[PDB]
C-alpha cells in the first residue's frame, strides 16, 4: 500500500481530500443553522485555489496560443499535416456542438435582450477595441427606456474570446515570420514553461482547496437529493454525448470519407480503446494505438506516426464534449440562462480548452476555468464535477483515442495516392 | 484592363468598395424611413474594421516608438543628422499648428470647464500615474457643487499622449543603453513586424469595411447637400493649408536661414514636385528628388543622401497638416467643441501620426485613428474623408516632398563649413 | 566652495530646493487668504514629480523582483547563503514590525469593517484574479443593508501586494528554470536598467518638484506649531525604533544564537558604525566593515566576503523600520485610520522597500512610494519627511551596518563546523 499510495502522491492526496471534504461537510450538515461567515471561512482555501488558478489563465492563454501556433512545422508536415489539422478541428467542433445540444435538451440543473444584439455583441467582443481593457472587460448591448435607446456598456469580466482571437492572429503572423521572430518564440516558450511550473505548484495545493470547496458546497446546498439527481443526470448527459459522438458521428464520418466499414475499423482499435478506458490517459495509450493501427489495420507508418502523437494532445473529442456539457451544467445549476452569444462562446472555448488540456488524467477540469470565466459563471461549482470526474475521464479518453484512430484512418485514405507516389519514387 | 485592375489589386478593391457603398447608400436612401437595427447591421462590418484597426494602435504605438527611437544611429549621423531631425520636427509642428489654426478659423462642420484646468489635465495625462490604467483611461478635472469642489475623475478612453510620452522616454533610454539592450531592440523589432503584418491583413479586409461604413453614413445623414458642402469646405481648408505652408512658410524658412531665393530653389525641385503630384507616394519620387537636387541645385551628395531617405518617411508636413485639419473636422461635424487640452493633443498626435505614416499612398487615414482615439471622437466618420482622400493625398505628398527638398537645402547650408573641412582633409 | 557644491551636484540642488521651497512658503504665508487654484499651481510641479515617480513603480516592481530572484546564485552560495538570507529576512521583518508597533503606540500625527473581513480581503488581494486588474484595482469587502449582505467590490488603487506575490513566484520559477530562461532574464535585466535610467532622469528633476511640494505644504497647513510638533515626535519615534532595534533586538539575537557577548562584538564594529554615521551610505562603509570584522573580530574571510556585500543592499533593518514608521505617520497626519490588512501591507511592503532601496543616501524616501501606493495614502506628504530626512538617514545606515555586522557574526558561528571541515580538507 505504501507503494500504492506513494506512486501517485498527487492522486492520493486529491482523492483523500475529496473524501475528507465530503465527510466533513456531511458531519457539519448536522448543525442545520450555520453562520454565513463560518461557511465563508470553511470555503476560503477553496477561494484561494480558485483565485490562483484564475490568476494564470491570461498568461496561459497568451503563451500557449503563441507557442502552439508557432511550433506547428506546417511546411515540414505537408498536406498530410493540413488534413490531420482540419480533421482535428472539425471533430472537436462537432463534439462541442453535440454536447451543447445535449445539455440544452436534457437540461440537468434546471430542476434545481434581442438575439440579434447578443450575436452582434459576440462579434464585437471577438474584436476588442483595446487589449488591456479586453483583459478584464467585455462590451455588451444595453437597452433602457427614454423608439428605444440602445448603447454599448462595458461589463466586467475577462474577454476570453477577444484575447484568443487576437493572439491566434498574433501567433499565426509570428509563425509566418519564419526564422525571424525566433527570439520572440523563445521568449514565449520560456514564459509558457514558467507558467506551467506555477500551475503545477498550484496543483500541489489543489487537495486542500478542493477539500474545502467540497465541504462548503455540501454544507451550503439545501437538499442533497436534488444535487445528487442533478449530478446523476449530468453524468448521463456526458455518457450519452460520448456514446453518440464516438459511436455514430465518428463512424459515420469515416464511412462517408472512406467508403469502408467503420466497425471493421473498431476491432483494430479495440485494444487501444480498452487501454484508454483503463489508463485514463491518452498519451499513455499511444504506443498501444500505434501497434494496433499499424498491425491490425495496416495503416502506413508515415501517416500514423504523424497523426497519433499530435492528436494525442490536440485532438480530444471527448474532453471537448465534456467541457461544453459541464459548462452549461454549471450555468444551469445556478439558474443562469445563457444567451446565444454565451452558447457560442461555450462552444468555441470548449474547442480551445480541449486543445490545451494535456493528456494527463483530470486536466479538463483545470481547462474548464477558461470556459467558466469566458461566460462569467461561478467557478466554485467545479468541485461538484470533481466529485465524479474520474468515471467520466475514463470514457473521455476512450472517446478521444477513438477519435485519434479514426483520424489516422481517414488521413491515410485521403493520402493513399501521395504515399503511393512517394514509395514509387 | 486586366493588368490595369490587377496591378494594384488593393487599390482596385478599395475604389470599387467605395463606389459600391456610395451607390448602395444612395439606393437605400429611397426608403426614407429606415430601421436603426437595419442600419446597424449594414454598418456592422465597418464596426468590425474599425475595431480591428483600433485594436492595434497600442502595440503600434509601443513597438513603433521604441523601434524608431532605438534605430536612429545618432552618433554615426553626426551634427548633420541632428540638424535634419530638428528641421523635421520644427516643420512638422508648424504644419500641424497651421492646420489647427485654419480649421478653427474656417470651421467646416459647425454649419451642420476652466481653460487652466484643461491645460493642467493635459499635463497630468502626459504623466500618467499608472501605465495599465493609461492604456484605457484618462484623468480629467470635474467641478460639482457642494467655494466650488474640484477633483480628478478617471474618464474612459486611451491615454495616447501619456503612453507616447512614457515610451518616447523608454526608447530614448534604451537607445542610450547602446550595444546592450540589443536583445530588447530585437524583441520589439519582431513585435513591430508582426503587428505590421496584422495591419496589412486588416487592410485586405478594408474594402468591405469601408464600403459598409460609407453605406451607413450615406443612409444615416439627413441632408446630403449639407454634408457635400461640409466636405467641400474641408477640402478647401486642406488645400489652403497646404498652399500656405508649402508656398510661404517653407520658402520663408529657407530664405531666413540661407539668405537665398527660395524660388530659385523651387525650379530645381519642380520635377520632383510634379512626380509627387503624380505618383502620390513620397518614397517613389525619391530617386527623382535625388537627381533634381544633386544636378539642378548642386547640393552635396552627403547631405542629400542622408536627408532625403530619412525625410521621405519621418518628414511629412502635408500629412501632418491634413491630419490635424481632418481630426478637427471630424470633431466639428459631430458638434463636439474641443478644449485647449484636446487641441494641443490634436497637434501633438498629428505630429506623431505624420511621422508614423509610411510613404505608401493613403496611410494618413490609417494613422488618423491615433488622433481620433487620443481625443475620443467617433472613428466611424473616417469614411467621409476616405471618399475624397486621393485628391488631397496627391497635394499632401507634393507638399512633403517640397519639405524634404527645403530641408536638404537648409541642412546643406548650415553644414557648408563642415563639409568643406572634410573635403579639405 | 565650488568643489564643495559641485562635488555632489544633486545633493546641492536638493538642499537648495528644500531651503528655497521652505522660505518661499514662509513668505507666502504672509498672504493669509490664498486661492486654492494658486496653491494648486504652486504645487503642480510637485504633482508632476509625484506622477513620474508613481508611473515607474510597476516596471520597477516587476523587473526588480524578477532580476533579484533570478540572480541569486543559490547553489554557488551554499548553506552559508541560505543562512545569510534567512537572517536578512528575519531581521528586516522584526524591524518593520517594531516600527509599526512604535508608531501605533506613540501615534505622532493623531494629535492633528470587521477585522476578519479585513484580513480575508488582505489574503484575497494577495492572490488577484487578474493581473491586468491587479495593476490598478484591489478587491475589498462591502456590507450594505438589505442578515446583512456582504459582497466584494473593486476599489481603485494598485494591488501592490498581489503583484509582488505573483512576481516573486514568477522570479522563483524562472530561477528554477536554470540555464534555460537566460533570454528572459536578460530581457528583464535590460528592462530594469532602462527603468533605473528613467528613475535617475526623474531624480535630476527632483529638486524643483520637492521645492514646489514643500512650498505647497507650508502654505496649505493651518498651524505651523502643530506640524513642527508632529515632525519632532515622528523623528523621536524613528530614533527610538532604531535604538531599540539595533541596541537590544540585534544584540539579543546574537547572544541567543551564539552564546557570546554582543558588547564585545560592538567594539569590533565601532569604526564601521561611526563611518556609517558619517558617510550616510552603507555601501561606502563596506571596506571599513570588512577590515573591522576581519581584524578585530576574527570572522573568517569566506563568511564575511559573502555576507557583507549582499547585506549592504538586501539587509537594511533601519530603512525598514523607518519606512514602516513613516508610512504610518503619513497615514496618521491625514486622519486615515488603518485596518489590520493595511497594517500588514505596510509591514510587508516595508520589508520589500528596504530590500529594493540601494545603499545610496536618501533612497528610502523614493522606495516609500511603494508603501504609500500599496496602502493608498496621499503621496504628496513625502516632502515633510524630506525636510528632516538626512538626520534620520545617518542613524538608519548606522543601524543597518550594525545589522550586517551581526549577521556576519551569526552566520560565521552557525558555519564554524562547515568551514572547519573545508579547511581540514
Ligand atoms: C457528423 C456529420 C455532421 C458530418 C460532419 C463531418 C464533416 C462536415 C467534416 C468532418 C471531417 C471533415 C473532413 C476532414 C478532412 C478533410 C481533408 C481536408 O482537405 C483539404 O482541403 C486539405 C488541404 C489540401 O487538400 O491540400 C478538408 C476536407 C475533409 C475531407 C473534411 C471534409 C468535411 C468533414 C468530413
Ligand atoms: C514659419 C515661421 C513661424 C518661422 C518658424 C521657423 C523657425 C522657428 C524654425 C524652423 C526651422 C528651424 C531651424 C532648423 C534647423 C536648425 C539647426 C539646429 O541647430 C542645432 O542646434 C543643431 C545642433 C548643433 O548645432 O550641434 C537648430 C537651429 C535651426 C537653425 C532651426 C532654427 C529655428 C527654425 C528656423
Ligand atoms: C528579537 C526576538 C523577537 C527574537 C527573534 C529572532 C528569531 C525569531 C530569529 C531571528 C534570526 C533567526 C535565525 C537566523 C538564522 C538562522 C539559520 C537558519 O538555519 C537554516 O535552516 C538554514 C538552512 C540549513 O540549515 O540548511 C534558520 C534558523 C536561524 C538560526 C534563525 C532562527 C530564528 C532567528 C533567531
Ligand atoms: N482524459 C483526457 C485528459 C483531459 C481530461 O480529462 O479532460 C485524456 O487523457 O485524453
Ligand atoms: N501621401 C503621403 C502618405 C501618407 C498620407 O497619405 O497621408 C506620402 O506619400 O507622402
Ligand atoms: N540610508 C540607507 C539608504 C536608503 C535609505 O536612506 O533609507 C543606507 O545607505 O543604508
Residue numbers in the entry:
A (entry chain A), B (entry chain B), C (entry chain C): 37 to 148, 162 to 195, 229 to 507
Q: What did the published study say regarding this structure?
A:
EAATs are known as excitatory amino acid transporters including five subtypes (EAAT1–EAAT5), which are responsible for the removal of glutamate from the synaptic cleft by rapidly binding and transporting glutamates back up into the pre-synapse or astrocytes, which contributes to the termination of synaptic activity and to the clearance of potentially cytotoxic extracellular glutamate. Among the five EAATs, human EAAT2 (hEAAT2) is predominantly expressed in astrocytes and was reported to be responsible for 90–95% of glutamate uptake in the forebrain by an elevator mechanism. Each subunit of the hEAAT2 trimer has eight transmembrane helices (TM1-TM8) and a pair of half transmembrane spiral hairpins (HP1, HP2). Here, we report two cryo-EM structures of trimeric hEAAT2 in complex with glutamate and WAY-213613, respectively. Both of structures are determined at 3.4 Å resolution and stabilized at the inward-facing conformational state.
In order to understand how hEAAT2 binds with glutamate, we determined the structure of hEAAT2 in complex with the glutamate (hEAAT2Glu) at 3.4 Å resolution. In the hEAAT2Glu structure, the glutamate is sealed by the tips of HP1 and HP2 loops. Specifically, the α-carboxyl group of the substrate glutamate forms contacts with the side chains of T479TM8 and N482TM8, and the main-chain N of S364HP1 in the tip of HP1. The amino group of the substrate glutamate is coordinated only with the carboxyl group of D475TM8. The δ-carboxyl group of the substrate glutamate interacts with the side chains of T401TM7 and R478TM8. In addition to directly participating in the glutamate binding, D475TM8 can also form one hydrogen bond with the backbone nitrogen of S444HP2 from the HP2, which contributes to the close-up of HP2 tip. Moreover, the backbone carbonyl group and the side chain of S441HP2 interact with the side chains of S363HP1 and A394TM7, respectively. Taken together, three pairs of hydrogen bonds, including D475-S444, S363-S441, and S441-A394, are critical to keep HP1 and HP2 staying close to each other. Interestingly, the S441HP2 is only present in the hEAAT2 and is substituted by a conserved glycine residue at the corresponding position of each homolog. We speculate that the unique residue S441HP2 probably provides additional interactions to stabilize the HP2 at a sealed confirmation and prohibit glutamate release from the intracellular side.
